[PDB]
Design a protein around this ligand. Structure first.
Ligand code: HEM
Ligand SMILES: O[C@@](Cn1cnnn1)(c1ccc(F)cc1F)C(F)(F)c1ccc(-c2ccc(OCC(F)(F)F)cc2)cn1
Length: 484
């Protein structure tokens, strides 16, 4: 009957890019107050159709394969970074199965092993990195936009790839990852390939790192066994065959490893950076966690080195802090699909034309007064309440569906959806919690920190993930239990 209201703009190309780009949530809210929950806005020559709130979550996440395409929207963002033939550079059925393959490395039995490895890496960083140097220093300053991206790549690599990779992680591979990371930008939506050096370094890093992985894949296939059913490389060695019998090439497997690492490390880097800062602003929250962790280990007759995956299950303060950080700082502010066939928006007369892009934003709801009281207050204790819990469950469907990587909720109508929903749902949620939880406990047990200001930095929405604005540091002291 009707196409959704288009948000007025003056600049013929730019559209609403400036405002949407600077502050996505504010922009959405201004648009909502004028037009309602469903509106369109022009962006770099593309028409973005937004559906705010839980009903929007349903509309986009649970949209039919035949109606919208995620790979149409993401191809240019990721393919040049990860490599060809995986993730968005393949049909959806291939993606579904790749997710299934990777999930075999993301189970409890693996996690139980990952935890000490992830802690060890953190501890090594504490001793060797100039931010900490805990054997020499007693006070210090940590730029969390340096420490967290680095710790996250060390812990994730050690965990998912194993010790060998950790072993070869010298400064040469450091440059590559930096060269590749620098190529992982929203600029790829607009400029995926250019002949200025930055791209050259990126393409070259992709080839080099994937080759490295390929070598390790082949080497392990032949001889390797550090320990049983350890990791992601083990998993893909075994689980590399599609349902039609087609098998991933070792180059494709390598490329999938890059995707998984890059996504996981980024989302985790930002999340840990954010909860270090927010905890700095509110140091008493640190002491709560500390108290909980220390009592727990006292029960146990142990020290931090005794802290297990199972222990992480007994620490609600840790897991509430991560929830709250993902509420206030979802790493993805926007999630796109391309409209491939005219969508009718149920409970309306609107029709979304083919060629539009549909945009869903759980972050909006996360940070909206409509769903969360005092949304801009960082309070992990809200997750012990009914209201918050109610915001985490989907009213309409408690039934579950399997898209090919295991059963997920059919219902996505929850205001709080940090890990998305439906077909393209995250598979890294539990791993993220294991990694972030270990990071958080290892920090809190050894250190206490504050921030210089009275406020956490403003978020930067121009990055691949929502990162803290550039000056972002914590000032740390040692806790009586500091291991060094
Ligand atoms: C705080 C941590 C993380 C957050 C907040 C997060 C968030 C998300 C979100 C919102 C999506 C849905 C994207 C969409 O619909 O377009 C997603 C998908 C995904 N995430 Fe994550 N993620 C996190 C960590 C990880 C980790 C650690 C891994 C890997 C181990 C991972 C791998 C994936 C994969 C494979 C997808 C699926 C993409 C698709 O099917 O199209 N994520 N993640
Ligand atoms: O969804 C990602 C990120 N992710 C999710 N979980 N972990 N990582 C992703 C998915 C699967 C992967 F294997 C690797 C990935 F990194 C992704 F595909 F790249 C992804 C897609 C979209 C976005 C994104 C979406 C919207 C953005 O807005 C910036 C703009 F407004 F355009 F300026 C900026 C970034 C970021 N990463």
């Amino acid at each position: 009957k009707k196409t959704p209201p288009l948000v007025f703009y003056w600049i013929p190309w730019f559209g609403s890019a400036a405002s949407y780009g600077q502050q996505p949530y504010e922009f959405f809210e201004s648009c909502r107050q004028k037009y309602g929950d469903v509106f369109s806005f022009m962006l770099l020559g593309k028409i973005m159709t937004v559906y705010l709130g839980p009903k929007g979550h349903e509309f986009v996440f649970n949209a039919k394969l035949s109606d919208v395409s995620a790979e149409e929207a993401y191809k240019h963002l990721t393919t040049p970074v990860f490599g060809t033939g995986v993730i968005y550079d393949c049909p959806n059925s291939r993606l579904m199965e790749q997710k299934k393959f990777a999930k075999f490395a993301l189970t409890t039995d693996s996690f139980k092993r990952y935890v000490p490895k992830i802690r060890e890496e953190i501890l090594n960083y504490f001793v060797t990195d100039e931010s900490f140097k805990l054997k020499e220093k007693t006070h210090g300053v940590a730029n969390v936009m340096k420490t967290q991206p680095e710790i996250t790549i060390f812990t994730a690599s050690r965990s998912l790839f194993g010790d060998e990779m950790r072993r070869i992680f010298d400064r040469s591979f450091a440059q590559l990852y930096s060269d590749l990371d620098k190529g992982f930008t929203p600029i790829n939506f607009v400029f995926p390939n250019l002949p200025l050096p930055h791209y050259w370094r990126r393409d070259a890093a992709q080839k080099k790192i994937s080759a490295t992985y390929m070598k390790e894949i082949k080497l392990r296939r032949e001889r390797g066994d550090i320990d049983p059913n350890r990791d992601l490389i083990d998993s893909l060695l075994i689980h590399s065959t599609y349902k039609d019998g087609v098998k991933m090439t070792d180059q494709e497997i390598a490329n999938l490893l890059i995707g998984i690492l890059m996504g996981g490390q980024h989302t985790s880097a930002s999340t840990s950076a954010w909860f270090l800062l927010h905890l700095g602003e509110k140091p008493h929250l640190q002491d709560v966690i500390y108290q909980e962790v220390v009592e727990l280990l006292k029960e146990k007759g142990g020290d931090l080195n005794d802290l297990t995956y199972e222990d992480l299950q007994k620490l609600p303060s840790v897991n509430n802090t991560i929830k709250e950080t993902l509420r206030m700082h979802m790493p993805l502010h926007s999630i796109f699909r391309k409209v491939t066939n005219p969508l009718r928006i149920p409970e309306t007369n609107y029709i979304v034309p083919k060629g539009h892009y549909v945009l869903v934003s759980p972050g909006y709801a996360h940070t909206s007064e409509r769903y969360f009281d005092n949304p801009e207050d960082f309070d992990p204790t809200r997750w012990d309440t009914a209201a918050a819990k109610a915001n985490s469950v989907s009213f309409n469907s408690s039934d579950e569906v399997d898209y090919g990587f295991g059963k997920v909720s059919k219902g996505v109508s929850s205001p709080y959806l940090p890990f998305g929903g439906g077909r393209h749902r995250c598979i890294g949620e539990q791993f993220a919690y294991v990694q972030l939880g270990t990071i958080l406990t290892t920090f809190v047990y050894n250190l206490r920190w504050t921030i210089d200001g009275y406020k956490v930095p403003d978020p930067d929405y121009s990055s691949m993930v929502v990162l803290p604005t550039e000056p972002a540091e914590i000032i740390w002291e040692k806790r009586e239990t500091c291991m060094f």
